[PDB]
Ligand SMILES: CCCCCCCCCC(=O)O
């Protein structure tokens with residue numbers, strides 16, 4: 001009783017559609033439709049970070065994709081980490097086009113724990129970490145403009161349990177992230193219980209995530225309870241790299257449950 | 260154990276990312292490796308329409324080569340179209356290169372022009388399957404860029420590679436500006452005293468394509484390298500289909516021409 005589904009994958013900071021390559025392959029081989037998107041200035045998106053200081057422009061690729069979805073079509077929307085904010089806005093805007101939303105170690109703000117709160121905590125876990133650095137394209141009087149992930153940070157905090165070739169891949173592809181302002185994010189991502197909250201939600205925890213500590217993740221799960229919490233043991237931050245098969249099986253299960 | 264420095268240059272539509280398996284093997288083995296993105300390739304910031312001159316496309320490699328102190332020799336590896344890039348680097352900084360390696364690369368020489376090799380190579384890409392061209396300069400002008408299609412990648416390029424690598428490529432390949440023959444001919448000028456002074460190895464890595472192999476054989480005949488090596492079971496992207504084999508071959512070459 002095969003039922004073709006449409007998975008939409010949204011990456012985390014510094015990454016792009018490319019990070020989902022193992023999952024995309026498994027999905028396509030299964031006969032499912034899968035769309036891996038590059039958010040603004042990510043992957044091979046043409047914009048450069050400094051060219052998109054407005055958060056709406058970082059999210060535009062997903063919003064535009066959602067708006068173009070055929071009528072009556074439902075998707076399984078998956079967001080990894082920072083990608084959680086993107087799918088959250090998609091849920092609030094197009095709740096009817098989403099069968100179920102999946103937050104993979106994702107920022108999952110809610111009415112009782114808004115985006116600014118989540119982003120501030122998220123920032124503290126990345127800014128200043130190991131060899132990560134910021135730039136000041138607008139001068140020292142202004143806030144730092146972009147954040148650049150360093151190879152040591154990637155090796156230790158993100159890809160510690162992934163094949164070494166995936167770390168090499170990431171080092172050749174990660175791009176800078178514009179340090180979006182708190183006020184800008186708070187105005188772009190506003191969630192309501194009747195829209196955002198009406199979409200089925202599942203959170204997937206990576207048990208060995210050294211990028212985002214469990215306390216923070218548990219905080220979001222507690223202050224904004226999802227319909228279900230799944231766990232993938234032995235996974236580092238990039239579950240799609242370290243535990244691809246398990247993630248795939250888990251996504252299929254989720255898709256069949258909320259179809 | 261002597262530490263070596265490998266510099267890897269990709270083919271059309273690709274970028275530094277395509278060498279990820281090789282980069283990992285080299286780094287874990289203790290060697291230094293630099294995989295470069297040519298213009299408008301991988302995460303290079305330029306877009307194809309911004310680099311209409313072949314010199315613009317080669318810029319990343321030439322800037323890198325210029326930054327190398329003469330005593331820091333490298334093993335320069337070029338894949339397919341990347342052969343033209345390393346050829347230019349060989350003519351400009353011949354002494355900084357211990358040995359140049361052409362992996363199924365376009366290897367023009369005095370007896371076989373760069374435009375000649377480009378036209379031939381392009382025949383197997385232009386108009387193939389779902390590949391397409393754009394006309395950013397209007398319909399009354401030659402096409403401006405070439406875009407590799409998914410079916411073309413699956414059937415002609417990644418046909419012997421893991422399916423996940425095909426997925427990776429589909430999410431990363433970028434358009435190639437259709438450089439003019441006149442431009443290429445002016446940019447890639449080689450001399451026996453400079454280009455010809457660099458040790459050169461050609462790696463034949465093709466399968467199921469007699470014509471492609473005939474083309475590689477033609478270049479080897481018209482521009483004889485110092486040595487020719489083979490890698491079997493490889494599709495267009497040897498670094499994806501036969502990584503361990505390519506890695507060991509590059510190390511063998513490096514240890515020989517040191
Ligand atoms: C809006 C800027 C906030 C900083 C980004 C911190 C999130 C790191 C998580 C990730 O996406 O892998």
Ligand SMILES: CCCCCCCCCC(=O)O
Pocket residue numbers: 270271338339340341377380381384436437438
């Ligand atoms: C740069 C001049 C345009 C050449 C035509 C395209 C050939 C691509 C060859 C390759 O890497 O397989």
